[PDB]
Amino acid sequence: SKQPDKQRKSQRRAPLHERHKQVRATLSADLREEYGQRNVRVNAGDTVEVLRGDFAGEEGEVINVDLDKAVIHVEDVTLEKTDGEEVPRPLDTSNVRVTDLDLEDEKREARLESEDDSA
Amino acid sequence: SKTNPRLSSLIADLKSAARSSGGAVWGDVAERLEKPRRTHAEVNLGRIERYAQEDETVVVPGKVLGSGVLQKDVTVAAVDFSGTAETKIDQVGEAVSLEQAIENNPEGSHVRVIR
Amino acid sequence: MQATIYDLDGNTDGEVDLPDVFETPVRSDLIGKAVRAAQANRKQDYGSDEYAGLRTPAESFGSGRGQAHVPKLDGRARRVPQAVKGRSAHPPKTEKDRSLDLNDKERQLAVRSALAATADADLVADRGHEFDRDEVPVVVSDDFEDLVKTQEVVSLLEALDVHADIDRADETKIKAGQGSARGRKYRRPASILFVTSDEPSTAARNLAGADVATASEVNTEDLAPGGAPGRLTVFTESALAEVAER
Amino acid sequence: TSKKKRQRGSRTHGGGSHKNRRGAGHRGGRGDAGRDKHEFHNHEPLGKSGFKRPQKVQEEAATIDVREIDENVTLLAADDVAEFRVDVRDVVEEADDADYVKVLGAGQVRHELTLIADDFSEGAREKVEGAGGSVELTDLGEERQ
RNA sequence: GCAUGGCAAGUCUAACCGGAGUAUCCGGGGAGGCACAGGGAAACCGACAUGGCCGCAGGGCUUGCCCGAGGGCCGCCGUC
RNA sequence: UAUGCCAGCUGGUGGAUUGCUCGGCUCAGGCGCUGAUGAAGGACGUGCCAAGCUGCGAUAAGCCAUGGGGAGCCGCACGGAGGCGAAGAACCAUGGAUUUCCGAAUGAGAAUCUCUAACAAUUGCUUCGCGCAAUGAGGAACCCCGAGAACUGAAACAUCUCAGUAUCGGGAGGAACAGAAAACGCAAUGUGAUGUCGUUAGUAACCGCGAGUGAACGCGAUACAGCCCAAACCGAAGCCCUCACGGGCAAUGUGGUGUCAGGGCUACCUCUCAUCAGCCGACCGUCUCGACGAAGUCUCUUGGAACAGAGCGUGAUACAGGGUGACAACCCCGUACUCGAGACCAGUACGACGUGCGGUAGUGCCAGAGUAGCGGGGGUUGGAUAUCCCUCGCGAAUAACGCAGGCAUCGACUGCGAAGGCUAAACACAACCUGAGACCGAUAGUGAACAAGUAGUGUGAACGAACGCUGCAAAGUACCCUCAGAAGGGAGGCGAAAUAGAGCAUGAAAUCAGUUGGCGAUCGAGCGACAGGGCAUACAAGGUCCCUCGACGAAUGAC
């Protein structure tokens, strides 16, 4: 709807299958040309480049994708705890760009290459 | 506190002429138009026909309405005329805006006020 | 008077008689009234729950315990307007008539008057619109309706030295206040109004601040947004002629 | 600024002592209470008067004064012009939901007219004839005797 | 009641119908209301688009003298 | 200088203010019945660890199928351990499985359990056997049928009013109810079932003729639709159960005919497209859900972060709204366009099957009784003589008759056939779905943004709160010292900020601690206003002020 309360609400309360769209990220120039799409759902296999936060400029493999919190962990994009341990700093896919896809799954690859559908 | 910008300008123009030319009617008419709308003239043709005379411009400090019959060939000057009024008047004389009259007669001479 | 017709390239292509209505004396008070009424007529009825604060058997103890005679329940004051959780004394009511009447003649006069304000460059410029043209409104060949791409309307407006107004409207304002909590965060200047004849211009409608309308039903509001007369308009060959009998 | 808008801070909002604006006692009773006692003034007096005939035994005549007819003779070009001849029935409005048309004699008649109507008043005729005109009583008008 | 505004011997549409940019808005809809004649319980009858005199504003003139809307005092008319 | 007064400063207390919105409020459109095939509701269970909420039911946050979906998942809820998922999980849609006990609660009983095969109870059919069936209870209001106040108004009060309102009893549906004239009565050569909306109209009518109460016909609209019996004349030509056999019903009449364009019958003309019954079966439209979906994440500067400024560029049938570390059409979800499905419209419209419309003449063959109507007594209504109903009593005609047209009777005239029945659409409500907003913005708005009908009160009926905000990211503070210490403190680490460190954005006043200026242990009380002195004062946002003399010099006015 046009009402802000309903918009945020339908986003926070969206069922799991509707949350994939909350972890989508724009594709690199090459990939957009290759699959005829502007973006895709970031997978734990993909490689990505950070374009906005304090880690803008870095690239790395996606190590985790959390649909519950709609965020992703990217290798080496971490924070140093008090005890010294190194933990990941969650990223919104909206500040990221996919530069390499993990197509180990026929379905995803098939979905990506089809035209009537987007992956 | 008039709302109509045209009525507001007509009043200003009426004062300009009364003060510049040797007209006392225009300033007089101005004063009446400044009064509340309910006091403005609402005259039918039957009244103009009864008290007007040719070559003497009839001045109505209000609006002219179409009831009655006008035969005399007179020039009626009013703030406004109803559609029918302006039609009947033009058939045997002429209907003019108070704005034109002020221009063709800034001195405001040979004029008869009717209400 | 006469109005110059323009082709999709922006080049002059003849001219037609500007209909008499465009000579109607400009009446900003009547126009303002017409807009005021249209704006009020779309407002929704509202009001607080009629039993709000009244769902309690709270009673006053009267004199005797050194307390004010205020209805209380479980040692808590209630119901009365001065009580926290008490009823609203004179709240908004659903039964209230929030519409405004307007005689048809008076309304129609306003439309004609707003149409006429459209043919006065000085007024249009006073209203705020940006443009480097002398003749107004802008009249264009009926082929304008056949356009499809927004960008194609862009080219034409640039050719007509009128695109500057869209640049003006290409700035949204994030309003001060809580309207934002209700979906009214943004607002923006009103730019060009496109009046066609068969259907509203789908090609022009998305332009910043643009409004599209049809000659048979263009109203005081699109002709004078907010009640301010003199909107930079662009008519269609046939629109111009159709508008003549409004 | 309206009167209402200036009341804040006044305490009594123009009511005088704050003991005045209470219930109906401040109005001497509700509605028309006391119309024969404390507030009898200017009230129509008590009592019955006259009677009414049944609504379907009542006749509502459609009337018109010669003045109206006569002032619009030329304009009524869509109506006979002889040595004017006018059937009032085709002139009077509301001449359908009326039981008949009657010509009244208010005003002057500066033309010779041949009027056709269900009924005329004495003065209506005196004037119409006196101006070189005539009056024709319709068939329905044949209810005088 | 009043102030403002539209139209004016008329004025306004109501429900509702069509259109559309779809609660806005454009067009249509005069059913009906109020006004355009009154008086009389009723039956029933049915009036000054001016006849006289004052005179404010305003206008005119040869600068007191004319014309004098509105207004004032009367006549006269309709009806009981 | 104690006790102390006034103002401020630093820190607290407190949670105002500003900003924010997962909640309300209101409007609009759509939709709309559930239950003995055991509902709605409740109880008790159910998780690896599980108190609350949610889900579920001993198969217990779930089992199966088909389609969608997709590389993740194991609810709210970010734990530990562990597990599931390419044998395609999660999740979503549709259909199915499981579905404890109490509950209409139905074998009997009982505070959710127990005792010894159960439609308990009332009914219909009946194979007279619970064999086949029905009822019961629920639902926000809406709807129909009954029972029916008072405060109040009348400035008292009794008729009247509040009001056929509140509340009570019974009952149906998705809508109800009404409905094809014994009508109307703009009286007519006129209208033509019924709701409803606008108007007629605060009119007619009522009324301590007071206060007050208050229609209708008509008209303009919405939507439209008309039919079936009883009897005459026929007289078993019939219906129900069962696969069948067979059984039950039915002469106290099943079935045919017929239904005011009256009908039937006898004699004829012509003809059927009326009606009734059944078959088939939508378009469109509306509501919802879904698929697809353009174009920057370029430079410099500031910043913790660019969504800022400046510069360059792009889409737009898309510049609605939201999200993203700050003002985003072009980063993400969407949005426009186009497309798909379900629901409603509707088993309706259309089409087709069968039936057969209608007209003439004759015929006193048929046509609804405690009725029509009158009287006694009440209620009710605008209903006045002239509303509608109840009750007691009386009580008719038979179409060649009868009722109505606002007092009664009789004639005339006009209308119409009561005492049998059914009937779509247009209208009410808001539970449910979706959308919307000059509504409120956490003492507001719901009682309820939070454990909310929660905590809690009352024997019970019933009553009933308060509590929103760390941060961009938990990076949610490692190590050390102190201490009885997982407390607290100190030092330290993180972050732009810890004066963001847990009811953790901001942080008012009242007020408290410490402290600065002024006053202060010989002095008097609306706490001040106006003058004038002391003391005090970083900048900024005010820059004037003082003395000699001179110029001007009102009223007044000298030694």
Ligand SMILES: [Cl-]
């Ligand atoms: Cl007049």
Ligand SMILES: [Cl-]
């Ligand atoms: Cl009468």
Ligand SMILES: [Cl-]
């Ligand atoms: Cl009728």
Ligand SMILES: [Mg+2]
């Ligand atoms: Mg692809």
Ligand SMILES: [Mg+2]
């Ligand atoms: Mg409240």
Ligand SMILES: [Mg+2]
């Ligand atoms: Mg504010």
Ligand SMILES: [Mg+2]
């Ligand atoms: Mg039992």
Ligand SMILES: [Mg+2]
């Ligand atoms: Mg009383």
Ligand SMILES: [Mg+2]
């Ligand atoms: Mg009563």
Ligand SMILES: [Mg+2]
């Ligand atoms: Mg009394």
Ligand SMILES: [Mg+2]
């Ligand atoms: Mg009543």
Ligand SMILES: [Mg+2]
């Ligand atoms: Mg009636």
Ligand SMILES: [Mg+2]
């Ligand atoms: Mg609250």
Ligand SMILES: [Mg+2]
């Ligand atoms: Mg805080």
Ligand code: NA
């Ligand atoms: Na309550």
Ligand code: NA
């Ligand atoms: Na309202």
